Curated annotation (Swiss-Prot), chain B:
The protein's name: Eukaryotic translation initiation factor 4E
Subcellular location: Cytoplasm, P-body; Cytoplasm; Cytoplasm, Stress granule; Nucleus
GO process annotations (BP): behavioral fear response; cellular response to dexamethasone stimulus; G1/S transition of mitotic cell cycle; mRNA export from nucleus; negative regulation of neuron differentiation; negative regulation of translation; neuron differentiation; positive regulation of mitotic cell cycle
The keyword Ribosomal protein belongs to this UniProt entry's keyword annotation: no
Source organism (scientific name): Homo sapiens (Human)
Stretch of the intact protein here: 36 to 217 of 217
Result, substituting S33A: Does not affect ability to rescue growth of yeast lacking a functional EIF4E/CDC33 gene
Gene Ontology cellular component annotations, sorted alphabetically: chromatoid body; cytoplasm; cytoplasmic ribonucleoprotein granule; cytoplasmic stress granule; cytosol; eukaryotic translation initiation factor 4F complex; extracellular exosome; glutamatergic synapse
UniProt modified residues of type Phosphoserine: S189
Posttranslational modification: Phosphorylation increases the ability of the protein to bind to mRNA caps and to form the eIF4F complex. Phosphorylation also enhances its mRNA transport function. Phosphorylation at Ser-189 is not essential for protein synthesis.
Length: 208, 197
């Protein structure tokens, strides 16, 4: 009665349609159901009005259908954010599953939009849907991409910043899967520190 | 697979269970010194049974009934205005309540409407549902389910028959479906009903 885990190679092989899905039993179930959110930035609107749920999915094939659809139907607008979160967790730090939590953060420079945004974001998505952090995948809430003019942010959000073992294992595996050099250190920030603006930086509770 | 909750399951969850859709609760007062942008205020969004009940229990305790007001629950991304792309070709099953039935049936009928929406009570035809509107008025209240396409007769009349069943209305009491394009034009004391159940 075990966790459903997909490595990167298996998820890539399941890409590009193909499956007949006979008996509604030929699709590959995910451990969790996931919801894709969009948060727009315009028209003098409340935080709630700008957050929109796009779509939910709980198979590898339906992930790839949505991915292929967004990849062909959507263009990149700064001010926007996309978030993939487990079903029942809103992509806001005030949520019961995020308020005690935080994020592993990747910051991309202006150059790296064109070179690394799509690659790093896909690798992040596969880490989530594939349950890549072993038992510590349960600490994962979701992932956020902030598209910005200064430079783009990609983050894995986790549920509890005081779970050092879980947080640091997520961190180490994520950095490995992004193929980041050991010189490039990524930082974990409590959402409670990120919420308070106190200077040019937020404190990192952990680094890998 | 579609997430469907019957009435009994949703009531059992009242003091997390995902909804098929995310829903947005809107409030609208008729005020001309402010116009349709400032009058229409978003109150809150939700996509679980428990968060529906938290908001319901909150509004039920914290809010008192003012005529001229309207509340609307619509799917996330559909504004509660007929000009919206998802409503302009559509219409509404309308329940009109007399002055007496404000005290007896408003809260009951409105709750039953809400459960039909969040529970996906119309089978595949729940996708034709946009939302629901309650207009609190002195003449007598209005409750309506809004659907996306008035030319989908099969979708529309299934919704109306299930809705009428869930309101526990007698078969003598016939409800009417009105195109938003007919309701927009004031032509007398009544609007034409494209269908009736
Ligand atoms: C920031 C990348 C953004 O780019 C779009 C093409 C618009 O610029 C984007 C957003 C969401 C998803 C997404 C799809 C399926 C499941 C979860 C998801 F988050 C994928 C992408 N991009 C893929 C590569 O283009
Ligand atoms: C019956 C109209 C109004 O009644 C109050 C007395 C108004 O001050 C009302 C409005 C919205 C909601 C509502 C709550 C949660 C989600 C969607 C909703 F539309 C519930 C109610 N009434 C509850 C039962 O009386």
């Amino acid at each position: 009665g075990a966790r459903i885990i997909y490595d990167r190679a298996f998820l890539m092989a399941c890409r590009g349609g193909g499956g007949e899905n006979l008996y509604f039993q030929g699709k590959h179930p995910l451990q969790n159901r996931w919801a894709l959110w969009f948060f727009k930035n315009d028209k003098s609107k409340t935080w709630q009005a700008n957050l929109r749920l796009i779509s939910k999915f709980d198979t590898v094939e339906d992930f790839w259908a949505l991915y292929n659809h967004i990849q062909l139907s959507s263009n990149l607008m700064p001010g926007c954010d996309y978030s993939l979160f487990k079903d029942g967790i809103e992509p806001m730090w005030e949520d019961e599953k995020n308020k005690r939590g935080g994020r592993w953060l990747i910051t991309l420079n202006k150059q790296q939009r064109r070179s690394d945004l799509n690659r790093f974001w896909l690798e992040t998505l596969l880490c989530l849907i594939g349950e890549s952090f072993d038992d510590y995948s349960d600490d994962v809430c979701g992932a956020v991409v902030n598209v910005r003019a200064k430079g783009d942010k990609i983050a894995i959000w986790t549920t509890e910043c005081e779970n050092r073992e879980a947080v640091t294992h997520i961190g180490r595996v994520y950095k490995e899967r992004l193929g980041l050099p050991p010189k490039i250190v990524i930082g974990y920030q409590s959402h409670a520190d990120t919420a308070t603006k106190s200077g040019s930086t937020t404190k990192n509770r952990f680094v890998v």
